[PDB]
Every structure is written in structure tokens, then in C-alpha cells.
Amino acid sequence: MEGLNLVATALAVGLGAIGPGVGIGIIVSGAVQAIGRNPEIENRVVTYMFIGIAFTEALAIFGLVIAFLIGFG
Template sequence: MSDMTWFVVLSTLGAALAIALGVVAPGFAMGRAISQALEALARQPEAEKAITRTLFIGLAMIESLAIYVLVVVLIILFRNPLLEYLLR
């Protein structure tokens, strides 16, 4: 196989590994945040609005991490900056 083929295969495997690891951590964090919010609601039902508002803001922050990973992976797959060095 040529150098270009190896580079594309390794870039694709790296991108797949990055998206897998980059989505697992926010997934666990979201599950834990929701679990803690439900516990807080069970203990203090009168604070529902404050807990829910804070939960949604926190979930949006956590989800942004997964979106950043997706953007980086798409850059690696479709416009790899290291490809220019290989073509020289």
C-alpha cells in the first residue's frame, strides 16, 4: 500500500477513536447530572424551577463538548492539515 493509503486509513481510525472517546465522557456526565437533578427534585420539590434551569444549562455545556469533538473529527476526515505535508 502507498503512503497515502496508510495515511487515510490511520486518519480514519484516529477519527473514529476520537469520536468514540469524546462522546462517552459527556454521555456519562449527562447521565450523572440528570441523576443528581432527580435526587435533588425528590428532596426539594419546591425548588423545581431552579434545579431544572440549572440542569438544562449544565446539559447544554456538556453537550457542547461532544459537538467540539465532532467538529475536530470532521476536520480530520475531510480537510486534514497534515495531508499537505504528505503530498510534497
């Protein structure tokens, strides 16, 4: 009909929010618990945490990019 592109973009952004959001939540909770258990290795695990985030958010970013393409052309 008419709002198919809007529904598509909305669904894509919503799914890229539900997946990566829980993913980065798990990442941050695990990293915080590991840091609390061992502050001496913190730097290393922090970097790994960031790397995980730098992956997970990237997926969400991809979804947003895809949605923007559907929004534009």
C-alpha cells in the first residue's frame, strides 16, 4: 500500500534494538562482574568488552543503515 516502507524501517530498527541491546547488556554485566572480581586485569577485559561492543553495536548500526537506505533509496 503506502506505509510498507515505514513499517519496514520501523521493524528493522526495532529488531536491531532488541537484539544488540540485550547483547550489549549481557556484555556490560559480564564485564562489570569480571572487573569486580579482578581489578588487576581490568584494562585487558575492558578492551575486550569494547571490542564486543564494537561488534554488537556495529550490527545494530548496520540495521540502522539498512533502514536509512529504505528511507532514502
